Amino acid sequence: DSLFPARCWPDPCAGITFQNDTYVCGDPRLGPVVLPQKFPLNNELRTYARFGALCPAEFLDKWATDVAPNGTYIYPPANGFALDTEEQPILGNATLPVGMKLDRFGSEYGTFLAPLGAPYIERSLPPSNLNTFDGMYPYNYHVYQVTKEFVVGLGPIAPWFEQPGMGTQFVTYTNVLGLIDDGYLRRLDESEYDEKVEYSNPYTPGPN
Amino acid sequence: SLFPARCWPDPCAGITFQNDTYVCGDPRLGPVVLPQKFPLNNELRTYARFGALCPAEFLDKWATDVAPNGTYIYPPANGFALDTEEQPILGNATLPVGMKLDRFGSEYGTFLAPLGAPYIERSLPPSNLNTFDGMYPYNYHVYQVTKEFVVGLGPIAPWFEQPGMGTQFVTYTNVLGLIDDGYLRRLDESEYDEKVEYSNPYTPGPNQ
Ligand SMILES: *[C@@H]1O[C@H](CO[C@@H]2O[C@@H](C)[C@@H](O)[C@@H](O)[C@@H]2O)[C@@H](O[C@@H]2O[C@H](CO)[C@@H](O[C@@H]3O[C@H](CO[C@H]4O[C@H](CO)[C@@H](O)[C@H](O)[C@@H]4O)[C@@H](O)[C@H](O[C@H]4O[C@H](CO)[C@@H](O)[C@H](O)[C@@H]4O)[C@@H]3O)[C@H](O)[C@H]2NC(C)=O)[C@H](O)[C@H]1NC(C)=O
Ligand SMILES: *[C@@H]1O[C@H](CO[C@@H]2O[C@@H](C)[C@@H](O)[C@@H](O)[C@@H]2O)[C@@H](O)[C@H](O)[C@H]1NC(C)=O
Ligand SMILES: *[C@@H]1O[C@H](CO[C@@H]2O[C@@H](C)[C@@H](O)[C@@H](O)[C@@H]2O)[C@@H](O)[C@H](O)[C@H]1NC(C)=O
Ligand SMILES: *[C@@H]1O[C@H](CO)[C@@H](O)[C@H](O)[C@H]1NC(C)=O
Ligand SMILES: *[C@@H]1O[C@H](CO)[C@@H](O)[C@H](O)[C@H]1NC(C)=O
Ligand SMILES: *[C@@H]1O[C@H](CO)[C@@H](O)[C@H](O)[C@H]1NC(C)=O
Ligand SMILES: [Ca+2]
Ligand SMILES: [Ca+2]
């Protein structure tokens, strides 16, 4: 296991315009050079091959508008829900219960969450969602807990970005920051998701 | 540590001992020894097998009886997550050639998950980790799609003190039949021991 597939050597960054040392090949779209070393992030990225079996320029040519710096990632249709045999998205509106733990790689202006602990490859995100923008949130990784019930679009994640997808995504009608200000989510600190028991479910009632 | 700290002393209170391979001697509570190597240990890293409950509390919540004759009670609608109208969220979907799937259970069943899904995303009871054939420790099987076929595809409801919210694939033929008819092949451990073997080379890029 390594950064680039062996095929990409001896010049794995050929075709890529360097911009800044922090990122693979200097391209922010390729994500950070250094990756998480601690639980749970290392657990969530343990199965993540950043480019699949592709090389950097091949990856951008497949998934973005241009290999050059002006290129932007192209996203799946239908908000990225897995499509059924009639090419309709699979989802339903569902109430998230108080106590449920969610997480997200990305800014709090987004509307896509996952269940706490979902592998990165289940989220069908590009490498740049691992870029750090706030030092207090390395890798742009945020964990939340539902404090008041609310309804989201809930459904399977389509494969994209050379990953299998098939986690569950929650698509909110208010962005994360707005949900926090309105009392629907609260932020969790590392000490609240560092133990196995903190990943279990005490809020769903049993059948008896 | 097999049990929540609150369960000491006498964490097996109320449990009839049957066989020393299982927690409290009870096969419903799963095996004493959990996976030590990759990928299985990665899938169980966030797994607290009783949540915050003690063994008898767990069986009282999720089974018909704490006594040996009690059996686990399963969620309605095949365990698909329910929407605000109490209807299961799923659709018929075609699984593409190349997709990798896994399963804790015998090949006579019909429930698969995407390769690498955490155990807690599957909403399975502890007994699905019991070994029945030495060739398949923890009853863990990995498959790859060799001919496309349609399955019921949808999010997994929380159950058994876990959050669920993986994706499940409910087949119309049992796994054994899908293998015999050429839709699935069995994977050797050597075919899912590297990160790149979890990526997705089969889904095509967007048309540009
Ligand atoms: C996913 O696809 C399912 C079908 O998939 C195919 O089949 C499976 C087994 C795989 O092989 C797969 O690969 C295939 O692609 C689909 O299942 C279908 O669902 C429909 C709708 O629910 C079912 O039709 C209903 O059947 C019942 C039973 O019909 C039999 O018995 C009656 C009573 O004796 C006879 O009169 C019939 O002729 C049949 O012999 C009917 O009662 C029912 O009628 C209802 O709807 C009509 C009008 O639509 C009303 O007038 C009635 O009053 C009823 O309200 C439907 O006809 C169909 O049987 C079923 N197929 C199979 C093979 O089971 C499933 O719905 C799909 N799921 C999703 C989420 O899309
Ligand atoms: C995107 O940019 C392309 C040109 O970029 C070229 O290559 C980079 C690495 C720099 O050397 C730059 O100076 C070069 O001109 C265009 O060919 C392409 O049309 C641009 N995309 C759009 C939509 O205009
Ligand atoms: C899901 O729900 C949408 C409408 O829900 C209502 O409006 C949104 C903006 C939220 O305020 C929500 O809480 C309200 O109940 C529909 O537009 C959409 O079609 C629904 N989708 C499905 C599959 O039911
Ligand atoms: C590249 O961008 C990061 C983002 O903060 C910055 O910390 C770093 O210093 C930049 N590289 C250089 C050489 O300035
Ligand atoms: C316990 O279970 C194992 C596995 O099913 C079996 O081989 C063994 O005979 C059982 N009894 C004892 C006493 O180990
Ligand atoms: C299980 O065994 C107990 C002990 O006799 C009995 O009371 C109970 O009815 C049996 N069946 C179930 C489903 O609990
Ligand atoms: Ca803690
Ligand atoms: Ca291998």
Numbering used by the authors:
A (entry chain A): 26 to 233
B (entry chain B): 27 to 234
Paper quotes:
Here, we report the identification of NADases on the surface of fungi such as the pathogen Aspergillus fumigatus and the saprophyte Neurospora crassa. The enzymes harbour a tuberculosis necrotizing toxin (TNT) domain and are predominately present in pathogenic species. Interestingly, N. crassa NADase (NcNADase) activity was not affected by either EGTA or Ca2+. Both AfNADase and NcNADase cleaved NAD+ and NADP+, but not their reduced counterparts, NADH and NADPH. The absence of ADP-ribosyl cyclase activity from the fungal NADase was further substantiated by its inability to convert the NAD+ analogue nicotinamide hypoxanthine dinucleotide (NHD+) to Nam and fluorescent N7-cyclic inosine diphosphoribose (N7-cIDPR), a reaction specifically observed for cyclases. These results demonstrate that fungal NADases are pure NAD glycohydrolases as they lack both cyclase and base-exchange activity.
The 1.6 Å X-ray structure of the homodimeric A. fumigatus protein reveals unique properties including N-linked glycosylation and a Ca2+-binding site whose occupancy regulates activity. The protein crystallizes in the space group P3221 with two molecules in the asymmetric unit confirming the homodimeric assembly suggested from the chromatographic analysis. The protomers consist of two domains, an N-terminal ‘thumb’ and a C-terminal ‘palm’ domain. The thumb domain, residues 20-117, is folded containing five α-helices connected with loop regions, and the fold is stabilized by two disulfide bridges, C33-80 and C38-50. The palm domain consists of a seven-stranded central β-sheet flanked by two short α-helices and two 310 helices. The location of this binding site is at the dimerization interface, just before the C-terminus turns to intertwine with the other protomer. The Ca2+ ion binding site is comprised of the side chains of D219, E220 and E223 as well as the main chain of S216.
